[PDB]
Design an enzyme around this catalytic site. Structure first.
Site: not given
Ligand SMILES: [Cl-]
Ligand SMILES: [Cl-]
Length: 162
Positions: A11, A20
């Site tokens: 991440e 994202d």
């Protein structure tokens, strides 16, 4: 290696609001704020999550606090889900981390829908499960990350994260 180090690799760490891989406002270590296209809505979620009037910027400690909560939430979601809990309980600790990883990225309901892959994992048909897992929007949109998670299910080792 452990689930925290694994998800930190997958991440990243960013201390300002970013989008994202799906275009959704996110901060920290993959903390999804909202699927709304309004940056103001994302900032409101961030302030509520942290407990102070930020303006889209947090500290590393604050990002790690959200991360700990989010990993907790993934585990709790697995354990409360009638499809995911038996699979999780059937796995070794390394493959348990792989399932937590998937739930962190896609959510409990999303992973619970992988009915055929879950059955192959429960049966410990590791190569067959790995083939089935790749037949997914998940794999196509994030193939390098999915490959790491799938290799972890296939081998029960951390080789993809070394
Ligand atoms: Cl939250
Ligand atoms: Cl990827």
């Amino acid at each position: 290696m452990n689930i925290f180090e694994m998800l930190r690799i997958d991440e990243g760490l960013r201390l300002k609001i970013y989008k994202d891989t799906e275009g959704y406002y996110t901060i920290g270590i993959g903390h999804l704020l909202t699927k709304s296209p309004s940056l103001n809505a994302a900032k409101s979620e961030l302030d509520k999550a942290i407990g102070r009037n930020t303006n889209g910027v947090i500290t590393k400690d604050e990002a790690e606090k959200l991360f700990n909560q989010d990993v907790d939430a993934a585990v709790r979601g697995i354990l409360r889900n009638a499809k995911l809990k038996p699979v999780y309980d059937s796995l070794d600790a390394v493959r348990r981390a792989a399932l937590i990883n998937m739930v962190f990225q896609m959510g409990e309901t999303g992973v619970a829908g992988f009915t055929n892959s879950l059955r192959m994992l429960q049966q410990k048909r590791w190569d067959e499960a790995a083939v089935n897992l790749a037949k997914s929007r998940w794999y196509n949109q994030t193939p390098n990350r999915a490959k790491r998670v799938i290799t972890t299910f296939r081998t029960g080792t951390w080789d993809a994260y070394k």
